[PDB]
Amino acid sequence: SEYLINSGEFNMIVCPADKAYYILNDDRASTETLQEFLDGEKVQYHRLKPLWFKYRADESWQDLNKKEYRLGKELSEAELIDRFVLKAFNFGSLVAVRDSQTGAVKIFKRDKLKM
């Protein structure tokens, strides 16, 4: 699936499968790509710059209990990305979600679609 995520004053499309996210602005390239995303048509991600989050493949951290975690052991990279995109973990940011196969779009925050 592909996720329209709000980060305050701008939206981004996150594609976990491709490890790519695209920052949308008030420009033609963004509005046309967003239109394709929402309308269930083939999304032309080629006309936007692909970025990815700057967590290391070997991220290690301590929780407040001082318990030690390592990415790929205690938590998978797939599970970490889930915690930023899924309705269960980041509903405060989740504007809309698109099914990759069927191209079916669920819109949560209609007010956040036009930024």
Partner: protein, 354 residues
């Protein structure tokens, strides 16, 4: 600039530097991801490497804009905040100022001057006249105010008392509202916010103050006795403090406000060169500040008395939660609104209003 009281070239240069601290959209995306995970994973130093890399890149941005950045005096990067006369202040004008995200923390100078608290309240006065008053506190459920005040007045005393700011002292003791002049605050916020929490803070110098942190609600600090020096940075510079979470209601930072600015210059140069806003809160003064304004407090008098009121957005018509106030860090709304603990906490507040 006109919203602050600049008194030197160094202070002016620090202020003009502020826009160059602001994170670009990609940096914001990574900051969002980091801070979201810092709460969700309960991991204060999640993506510490990115944060370190960001600080280095951001320092290079300052050095590019200011080639002789190394020469400016980091000790003189503190900018005095402007205070207002609330004599002719109406709730409608006040609520507009509160809702304006471009406005810094609002200081009402001598707003509580004609209250009984500001006129009469001292450690000595409170001990004899308020023997029955209990406050939510513990040594580092409820304890007698007299007991805490006596211990703070004793120089040989061992135990320091931590006072919980998640209390309702005005609910417990409604008579204190008019005494400290809290009804003036309720009047100003009527139809905008309801008073969720209230607490009376009494201290000596065994508690130096509070280190860098930020709130997720509207706060009102009512200065009754003694002086506290408040530090602030612009919410958009919050990231330089290395912010983290001890739960949704524990928005903390790792920057130590006590340290010499020339020591900070070595270890935390972004904080060292950043414009830091300060006010000396004197008896009768009230400071109002909105969400995600990082601040530190330093007790400057041997004894201090200060009342704190936390306000939550309401709709009188509906009775329910009011629309979230405009902010300079809307990303924190997204992070907190994703935490089920914080969501339940916010609904529990509204259940407790009824």
């Amino acid at each position: 600039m006109e919203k602050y009281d600049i008194q030197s070239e160094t202070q002016r240069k620090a202020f003009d530097l502020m826009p160059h601290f602001f994170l670009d959209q990609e940096e914001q995306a990574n900051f969002h991801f980091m801070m979201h995970m810092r709460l969700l994973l309960n991991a204060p130093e999640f993506m510490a490497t990115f944060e370190r890399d960001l600080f280095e890149k951001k320092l290079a941005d300052l050095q590019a804009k200011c080639p002789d950045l190394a020469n400016m005096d980091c000790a003189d990067t503190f900018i005095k905040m402007k205070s207002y006369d609330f004599s002719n202040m109406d709730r409608h004008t006040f609520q507009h100022m509160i809702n304006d995200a471009s406005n810094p923390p609002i200081i009402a100078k001598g707003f509580l001057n004609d209250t009984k608290a500001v006129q009469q309240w001292t450690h000595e006065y409170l001990i004899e006249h308020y023997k029955d008053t209990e406050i939510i506190a513990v040594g580092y459920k409820k304890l007698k105010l007299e007991k805490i005040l006596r211990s703070q007045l004793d120089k040989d005393s061992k135990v320091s008392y931590y006072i919980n700011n998640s209390a309702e002292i005005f609910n417990d003791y409604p008579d204190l509202i008019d005494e400290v002049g809290a009804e003036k605050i309720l009047d100003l916020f009527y139809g905008h916010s309801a008073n969720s929490f209230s607490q009376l803070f009494v201290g000596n110098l065994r508690t130096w103050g509070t280190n860098w942190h930020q709130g997720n609600d509207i706060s009102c600090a009512l200065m009754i006795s003694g002086v506290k020096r408040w530090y602030f940075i612009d919410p958009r510079l919050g990231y330089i403090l290395r912010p983290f979470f001890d739960g949704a209601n524990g928005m903390s930072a790792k920057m130590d406000a006590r340290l010499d600015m020339n020591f900070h210059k070595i270890h935390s140069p972004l904080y060292a060169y950043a414009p830091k806003f300060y006010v000396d809160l004197e008896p009768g003064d009230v400071i109002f500040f909105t969400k995600y304004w990082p601040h530190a407090v330093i007790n400057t008098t041997p004894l201090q008395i200060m009342a704190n009121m936390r306000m939550t957005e309401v709709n009188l018509d509906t009775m329910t939660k009011g629309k979230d106030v405009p902010t300079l860090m809307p990303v924190y709304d997204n992070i907190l609104n994703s935490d089920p603990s914080f969501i339940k906490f916010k609904f529990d507040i509204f259940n407790n209003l009824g």
